[PDB]
């Protein structure tokens with residue numbers, strides 16, 4: 001069980017860790033988050049009480065280093081940093097635990113939500129989507145744009161998701177125009193799975209990361225990307241049997257975890273109605289269709 | 301963007317453009333099987349591809365053999381249309397290729413866009429105008445060459461005959477759309493107006509009769525009456 005200590009909390013902020021969150025008051029004696037489950041990526045994230053504009057946060061994996069948070073009054077945000085001195089850190093953490101100034105990552109033992117939302121998400125792939133190789137952790141916020149969004153402006157601050165475009169030469173074999181447009185299996189299985197992602201695990205990891213950035217930061221380009229990766233599978237007539245089964249599990253936990261009060265912006269009517277009711281895989285998403293119907297029958 | 305009443309003069313500027321109408325590509329005569337069920341039999345069709353400034357019609361005849369053993373023909377027809385239009389553009393010299401293609405039905409947008417991915421700077425546009433190009437098969441010489449085709453075949457016509465010697469493109473397009481709108485609303489009466497007078501002939505190399513300017517005004521008037529009338533016979537006004 002690992003720990004992310006905080007130097008202090010000088011400004012009032014709502015702090016999230018994965019799907020959990022708590023309110024910290026201005027200069028309340030908060031000094032971090034303990035008992036963080038090892039073996040998964042995690043995201044710590046922030047919404048200042050004053051300017052709810054800009055949700056922002058940090059993706060990280062405690063196996064790759066000791067990380068802490070410290071507020072910067074110049075740049076006006078809680079920054080993640082790496083401590084390179086092991087004994088300094090354990091001592092900080094031990095002293096902070098001794099005075100019980102840390103919250104406990106509040107995981108129910110019965111609960112596999114986080115595992116299921118991050119099953120295929122690896123820090124190595126996050127660090128390629130979010131480029132900043134001088135840090136072992138990755139910053140993301142509400143406003144960051146995707147590579148594909150910038151094509152249609154600061155590259156160092158972009159989300160380098162894989163570009164998907166259904167009316168593109170990469171998507172459409174010369175001579176198979178109608179075939180490839182109406183059945184995207186070529187583009188899914190040859191171009192993307194075999195060519196770009198190499199395997200479905202890496203495809204699912206990007207899909208899941210894109211969803212998580214859409215949900216936790218309201219990142220619009222991430223939401224676009226999540227839906228495009230769903231549509232590309234649902235619009236392929238030929239999908240490996242294991243991918244279809246796993247996709248249903250993946251989407252199920254994403255829709256289960258979505259705030260009920262956010263489905264107006266984060267869910268694309270056209271994509272879901274096509275995916276569940278008109279596409280090749282309309283019948284292969286029983287659990288996802290089931291929870292979408294009992295929970296968001298309005299959108300449909 | 302979309303083409304409408306507001307930007308109508310753009311059709312006659314000096315940027316090459318083509319209208320593409322697919323309404324006569326897939327044509328059937330639905331009938332009854334011996335078992336009392338219903339079958340379609342296809343007949344030959346055509347793509348109607350028109351330069352509105354010059355009057356150049358590229359009439360691609362769609363022979364019924366193209367449908368043999370195919371499924372979902374109404375959907376295939378849009379993709380076949382797009383395949384043929386893209387092939388036409390590729391066949392033209394660069395300086396003759398259009399800058400824009402305006403499809404008369406929105407269902408042609410994605411098929412044409414996908415076939416023209418090699419041509420990123422050719423704009424594919426829909427229109428809000430309800431143009432009467434379906435009625436092209438009411439022009440006897442066009443109907444005749446489509447029905448007689450025994451193989452795929454491109455036929456090249458000026459749909460304005462020699463009108464551009466005497467009138468502008470704007471005026472020629474307006475005359476064309478009035479004639480076709482009339483043929484579409486009451487083909488029989490429309491053809492009566494055009495052929496009523498045995499002294500007026502159609503040149504072997506033309507589609508429409510050789511009317512003087514004054515006779516064209518009389519004809520055009522008679523065509524407007526018909527279109528209003530039929531608007532009253534249908535709407536009882």
Ligand SMILES: NCc1nccn1Cc1ccccc1
Nearest residue numbers: 355356357358455456457458
């Ligand atoms: N060659 C038949 C003909 N008749 C009149 C004009 N033309 C040439 C032409 C070229 C392209 C399209 C349409 C017409």
